[PDB]
Amino acid sequence: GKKMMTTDGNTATAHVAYAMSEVAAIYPITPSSTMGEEADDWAAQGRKNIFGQTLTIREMQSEAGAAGAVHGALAAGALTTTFTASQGLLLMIPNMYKISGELLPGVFHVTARAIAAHALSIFGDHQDIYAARQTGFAMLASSSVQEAHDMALVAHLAAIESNVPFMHFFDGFRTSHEIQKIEVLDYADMASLVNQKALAEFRAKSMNPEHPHVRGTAQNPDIYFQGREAANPYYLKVPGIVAEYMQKVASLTGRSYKLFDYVGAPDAERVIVSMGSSCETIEEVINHLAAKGEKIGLIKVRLYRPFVSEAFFAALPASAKVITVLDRTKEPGAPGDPLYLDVCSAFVERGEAMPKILAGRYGLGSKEFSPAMVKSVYDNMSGAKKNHFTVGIEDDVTGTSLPVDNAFADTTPKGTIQCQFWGLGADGTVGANKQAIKIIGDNTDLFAQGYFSYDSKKSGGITISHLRFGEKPIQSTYLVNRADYVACHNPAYVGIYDILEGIKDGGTFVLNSPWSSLEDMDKHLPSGIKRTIANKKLKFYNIDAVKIATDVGLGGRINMIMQTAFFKLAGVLPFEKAVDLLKKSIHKAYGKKGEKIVKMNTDAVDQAVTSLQEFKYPDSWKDAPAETKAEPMTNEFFKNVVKPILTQQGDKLPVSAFEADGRFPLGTSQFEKRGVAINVPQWVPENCIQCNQCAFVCPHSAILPVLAKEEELVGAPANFTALEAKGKELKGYKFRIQINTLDCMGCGNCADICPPKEKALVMQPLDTQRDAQVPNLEYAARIPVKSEVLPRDSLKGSQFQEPLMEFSGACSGCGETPYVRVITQLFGERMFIANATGCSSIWGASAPSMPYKTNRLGQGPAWGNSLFEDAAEYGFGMNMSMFARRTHLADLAAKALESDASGDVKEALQGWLAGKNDPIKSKEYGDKLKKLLAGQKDGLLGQIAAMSDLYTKKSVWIFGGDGWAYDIGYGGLDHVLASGEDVNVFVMDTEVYSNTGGQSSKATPTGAVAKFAAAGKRTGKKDLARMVMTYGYVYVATVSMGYSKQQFLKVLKEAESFPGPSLVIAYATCINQGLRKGMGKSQDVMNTAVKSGYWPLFRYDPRLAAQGKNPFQLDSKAPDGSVEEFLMAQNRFAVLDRSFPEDAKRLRAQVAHELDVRFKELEHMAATNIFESFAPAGGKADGSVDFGEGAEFCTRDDTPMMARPDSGEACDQNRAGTSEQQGDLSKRTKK
């Protein structure tokens, strides 16, 4: 039977799916990625489904592939599932039609997520389910973690019996990711509800060569329409079947459901129709308001498709006088959203009462649907009756939003503690929170709920948690506003963020901070806070967790201490049980490396409880008063949009703050200066050999090489030390390494690679640096970058360029950013970047912060993320546009030469025409022309004057990682590359799907441990390089920064210049590869990757074939046995060793054998006399000819597919034989 469990909606549903499934074809997509991974770990742990078998999970190349795999399985008799969201779901639409079309019991669990329109979103809403509204799948929505378990069960059983597939969805993140104490079911119970007669029939109806049948047939108009209506009886029965099962499950659970369910007053006059998690919060308000005499209600929709009107009505009170239908989506241009549209058709089709239906929209993209907003939905029903409104936003442009009053009271049940925790990434706060929930929920019989707000910044990002405990079930599917206990685990927050917003009177508040004395405390906390702490009469507790942690031996790790404060001061448990329960867990978890650790944790709990006393404060706080703004210049935009968002006030921005098409300006990153590195490399002038490897290596542009001639260094700081410039060309200048100690992640990469024995760069805590190195940076910042002094694309000269991509919200020591920065240090001013989704787009474009910037001249990388599946074909689009627009310019210029245009004008014009595709001459000439046609506005000459942003050749880049290039986007990568046109694709190889969870990609190595490769991948790496090298006309090269920066630059220069396609795959490090010694060891690692033979560097350049030379060049030397010492250094490879030695020793040998073979094959290619020649292109010329001209026999068929406008002329359909057979025949009758 039943089992208590405290988890999220995802695992709540993956519980049921694993039980009811025999096969799962899968693909990772946030927020639904978990489900598939758990389905997989469980299977890997021998877990049995209801038939006593472990699940067959396989990972596809995309979710369309997964959709098709799911289709073939069902067809073939197995019961199947899949987990998906937003775009993933859209890709499964074509199959879904086939799947329900052929009446198969498929079941899709989707964590309803928003669709990428003006912007992308991982958050929750119904834009994707509503997109599959017509595929024929049944839809059943759960509105709470408990409901995800049940509803998933209902969906499986009903599918088996009805033969109509089911899509079970719950809101993304707000349910998928909400921990909550629920009651699950044993597989045996699920097994017991299965219609066996139906299941045994699914088996016989299936494909099998023993008793075959053909499905999928192409039908004409005579029978299509009929065969389409032939499934009606089924859709007629799918509702009762759902009702039957909601009933059976309720029989075992006690939790009862209806197709549509009413909640609220029997004589409510104002009813609301909602679907998804809004219902919980709406219900919660309903209670509050109703206790006060209000006649309000709610119909929570369960079974959205089929839409049984009969049941709709059976849930709507007869007194409903006004009813508003809430939709979590926006169909641009429809006369209303889906739910609203459906309800209406019921009301008209009913032909009686007509309550005045109002339509409203909420929660798009995980926007909050708090109580105040519901109060607002309601107040509207009785007041203004604004139709087609929005709630949650201030719509000042169209004016469709409802006003919201936050003074609205708290509506959580009586006896409910609400908590919030503010922490830094990787301080264990969230972990501790999830722990305190298992602990409380498992040793008390209170309901526990937990929701965690995160950060888009990968390193040092903030994180706020919302926990809730109470004697009553928690229906609050919204963030906590009236906090009982607010805790702040990173002292830096106090100053910057609104930590105490909404805290209840006398609400305890703990702060991790060393300001133990009223003195220091007074010299840090802002006015607003002291005051807040005061008038609200808070119980302020300050605790120096860092020190107590260091003291008790836990090396300054505050988690267990700040965990103590919760248990002790939180108010959820009585002191003795709290501190009891906590210790019991210290042993269960832990009990790892013996007692020492354990005890050292216990002691932390002790002193934590001991040092945890009320900070007593002066009444003065009641009117502590205001501070001064040591604020820098920041833009008109940073000031107005990017700062407000970064300080957690983006909800406050009305719609007028944003651009209709959702664009964003570059360089907003410049003004961020997060300053979160612990240690920042500090310069040592007397050791610097002046080389520029440090900046060239900094994955965030934290190091800035200054070369300034002496009179620029005048008002320079006392301490702005600079050496004399080594170099011929470099003589009148002084060179200095400027550390931006506020845009550093303290990864340690630069110092680690810094060449001299007596290092030039040394790691020092940020506070020993910042005071002195801040002003210096600024100074060094408003000094000219010497772009022309040294060869642009020379390691040293490259670091003397404007880096057009700085301070990305990417991990410290990320392996992607060093590459892409220098790519812009070489082509920045004229490049198009079509970025495939992944860390590239996440670090490269997470609103509001944008790394990429323009140069001194206002030009920089035109950046845009289309989707994940199509980065290349997107960048091929731009390429085509440039052709046409640039061709127009050339026919126009070619025409101007035939005019009475100036001689100079004509001289620029043919020079340009002659150098159109030269990124030097095209600009040299376009500029002469830009000045020459200045002002020109009439005819031809004016036209050309206006096409000035087309004069200089642009560089079209396609950015993406291994998951895109090798998997989902390969097919396209391949096509664009085969197209032979001039685009440049740069693949950052992390050897796994990073951005989403380190899922194994087709690029992942033999034996590497990733998701869905949990026992170490048991297949070789996909050889993309050798794969595209077969074309012969595509420049292909591989690189590794740590090994050769010279060779990287030689590839950038060569790839971009080959008049045609270029593939560039670079070894990129990642938190996911798990570098044992740190990401500072990253460069050293890329470098070992090439030495070991693991990653050889080569180049295949067809222009060499053009000159009769072999285009294949190896650049790395043979393997040097480093292999194992290389693999055993990454956790990805070492975990398998720890946990599967017998299997692991085998695979690292496989990988050591593979790199040995590939490199021996890389050897005689370099030496091959045989090879594929080259021509850029050159011929065609005006002329079209159909393959059908002057053909003797028919070249087309009687099929309607081949019929063309000018087709129909007679010919020999080959029914009478071969020519010679026709003739030997004529020459055999003649007469």
Binding partner selected for residue 1062 from ligand TPP, Ca ion, ligand SF4, none, CB under the kind-specific 5 to 8 Å limit: Ca ion
Task: Measure the CA–CA gap between 843 and 855, rounded to whole angstroms.
Answer: 20
CA nearest neighbour of 815 among 991, 958, 680, 984: 991
The answer to whether 1033 contacts its own copies (rule: CB under 8 A) is yes
Q: Is residue 222 marked as binding?
A: no
Q: Which is nearer to its own copies, 915 or 1016 (CB)?
A: 1016
Q: Based on the residue annotation, tell me whether 163 is a catalytic residue of this protein.
A: no
Task: Choose the binding region for its own copies from 285-293, 525-533, 622-630, 653-661 (rule: CB under 8 A).
Answer: 653-661
Q: How far is CA 302 from the centre of its chain?
A: 29
Task: Measure the CA–CA gap between 516 and 494, rounded to whole angstroms.
Answer: 15
Cα–Cα distances in angstroms (integers) from residue 1196 to residues 218, 1188, 1190, 1214, in the given order: 19, 8, 13, 11
Q: Which is nearer to ligand TPP, 146 or 1000 (CB)?
A: 1000
- Positions 971 through 990 that interact with Ca ion (CB under 5 A): 982, 984
The answer to whether 484 contacts its own copies (rule: CB under 8 A) is no
224 by Cβ neighbours in 10 Å (0-12 / 13-18 / 19+) ranks as exposed
The answer to whether 1071 contacts ligand SF4 (rule: CB under 6 A) is yes
Q: Based on the residue annotation, tell me whether 30 is a catalytic residue of this protein.
A: yes
The answer to whether 993 contacts ligand TPP (rule: CB under 6 A) is yes
Q: Which is nearer to ligand TPP, 512 or 996 (CB)?
A: 996
Q: How is residue 1093 annotated by DSSP?
A: S
Binding residue (CB under 8 A) for its own copies from 83, 108, 137, 202: 137
Q: Tokens for 365, please give them.
A: 């993209």
Cα–Cα distances in angstroms (integers) from residue 525 to residues 427, 515, 520, 539, 648, in the given order: 22, 9, 9, 15, 19
Angle between helices 559-569 and 594-611 (to 10 degrees): 50
Cα–Cα distances in angstroms (integers) from residue 409 to residues 291, 477, 963, 1000, in the given order: 13, 16, 48, 48
Q: Which residues contact 1189 (CB under 8 A, 6 or more apart)?
A: none
- Positions 905 through 944 that interact with ligand TPP (CB under 6 A): none
Query: Within a 13 Å sphere around the CA of 143, how many CA atoms are in the beta-carbon half?
Result: 25
Q: Is residue 1060 marked as binding?
A: yes
- Inter-residue contact 318 to 311 (CB < 8 Å): no
- Positions 308 through 367 that interact with its own copies (CB under 8 A): 309, 327-338, 340-342, 344-349, 351, 354, 356-357, 363-367
Binding residue (CB under 6 A) for ligand TPP from 988, 1013, 1039, 1071: 988
Q: Tokens for 1006, please give them.
A: 């033999």
Q: Is residue 963 marked as binding?
A: yes
Binding partner selected for residue 962 from Ca ion, ligand TPP, ligand SF4, none, CB under the kind-specific 5 to 8 Å limit: ligand TPP
List the catalytic residue out of 7, 10, 11, 30.
30
Report the phi/psi class of residue 798: left, alpha or beta, with left for phi > 0 and alpha for psi in -120 to 50.
alpha
List the catalytic residue out of 37, 38, 59, 63.
63
Binding residue (CB under 6 A) for ligand TPP from 408, 964, 1031, 1033: 964
- 988 phi/psi in degrees, rounded to 5: -90, 110
Helix residue spans in 1131-1182 (DSSP H): 1131-1139, 1141-1166
- 728 phi/psi in degrees, rounded to 5: -70, -70
Q: Which is nearer to Ca ion, 164 or 956 (CB)?
A: 956
Query: DSSP letters of 781-844?
Result: HTS---TTTS-TTSHHHHTTS--SB-S-S--TT-SSHHHHHHHHHHHGGGEEEEEPTTHHHHHH
Q: What binding mask, one character per residue, do residues 276-305 give for its own copies by CB under 8 A, x or -?
A: ------------------------xxxxxx
Binding residue (CB under 8 A) for its own copies from 2, 118, 587, 937: 118
- Residue 453: CB minimum distance to its own copies, A: 8
Q: Tokens for 755, please give them.
A: 């060449």
- Positions 622 through 681 that interact with ligand SF4 (CB under 6 A): 677, 681
Count of CB atoms situated within 10 Å of the CB of 159: 32
The answer to whether 692 contacts ligand TPP (rule: CB under 6 A) is no
Binding residue (CB under 6 A) for ligand SF4 from 193, 298, 811, 1066: 811
Task: Measure the CA–CA gap between 76 and 826, rounded to whole angstroms.
Answer: 54
- Residue 497: CB minimum distance to ligand SF4, A: 24
Binding residue (CB under 6 A) for ligand TPP from 25, 29, 320, 1051: 29
The answer to whether 996 contacts ligand TPP (rule: CB under 6 A) is yes
List the catalytic residue out of 481, 995, 1006, 1072.
995
The answer to whether 1044 contacts ligand SF4 (rule: CB under 6 A) is no
Q: Hey, is 733 helix, strand or coil?
A: strand
Query: 1037 has which bridge partners?
Result: 1064, 1099
Q: Is residue 488 marked as binding?
A: no
Binding partner selected for residue 28 from Ca ion, ligand SF4, ligand TPP, none, CB under the kind-specific 5 to 8 Å limit: ligand TPP
Q: Is residue 749 marked as binding?
A: no
Task: Choose the binding region for ligand SF4 from 160-168, 499-507, 537-545, 989-997 (rule: CB under 6 A).
Answer: 989-997
- Residue 1203: CB minimum distance to ligand SF4, A: 13
List the catalytic residue out of 49, 81, 111, 113.
113
- Residue 728: CB minimum distance to its own copies, A: 33
Q: Based on the residue annotation, tell me whether 444 is a catalytic residue of this protein.
A: no
Buried b (16+ CB within 10 A) or exposed e, 71-101: bebbbebbbbbbbbbbbbbbbbbebbebbbb
Task: Measure the CA–CA gap between 1040 and 1050, rounded to whole angstroms.
Answer: 12
CA nearest neighbour of 283 among 299, 304, 267: 299
Q: Tokens for 1012, please give them.
A: 């869905």
Cα–Cα distances in angstroms (integers) from residue 396 to residues 365, 649, 650, 652, 1218, in the given order: 19, 17, 15, 12, 76
Task: Choose the binding region for ligand SF4 from 810-818, 1030-1038, 1137-1145, 1155-1163 (rule: CB under 6 A).
Answer: 810-818
- Residue 649: CB minimum distance to its own copies, A: 8
The answer to whether 88 contacts ligand TPP (rule: CB under 6 A) is yes
Helix residue spans in 554-629 (DSSP H): 559-569, 575-588, 594-611
- Positions 398 through 427 that interact with its own copies (CB under 8 A): 398, 400, 425-427
Rounded to 10 degrees, the C-alpha dihedral 25/27/32/37 comes to 70
Task: Choose the binding region for ligand SF4 from 170-178, 623-631, 654-662, 813-821 (rule: CB under 6 A).
Answer: 813-821
Task: Choose the binding region for ligand SF4 from 37-45, 67-75, 333-341, 740-748 (rule: CB under 6 A).
Answer: 740-748
Q: Is residue 16 marked as binding?
A: no
Q: Based on the residue annotation, tell me whether 113 is a catalytic residue of this protein.
A: yes
List strand residue ranges (DSSP E) for 1046-1199, in order.
Answer: 1062-1067, 1098-1100, 1112-1114
Q: Which is nearer to ligand TPP, 915 or 960 (CB)?
A: 960
The answer to whether 1062 contacts Ca ion (rule: CB under 5 A) is yes
Residues that are catalytic: 30, 63, 113, 995
Binding site for ligand TPP (CB under 6 A): 28-29, 63, 87-88, 91, 837-840, 868-869, 960-964, 988, 990, 993-996, 1001
Binding site for Ca ion (CB under 5 A): 982, 984, 1058, 1062
Binding site for ligand SF4 (CB under 6 A): 458, 677, 681, 688-694, 697-700, 702-703, 737, 744-750, 754-756, 760-761, 810-811, 813-816, 839, 843, 990, 994-995, 1070-1072, 1197
Question: Residues forming the annotated binding site for [4Fe-4S] cluster?
Answer: 688, 691, 694, 698, 744, 747, 750, 754, 811, 814, 839, 1070
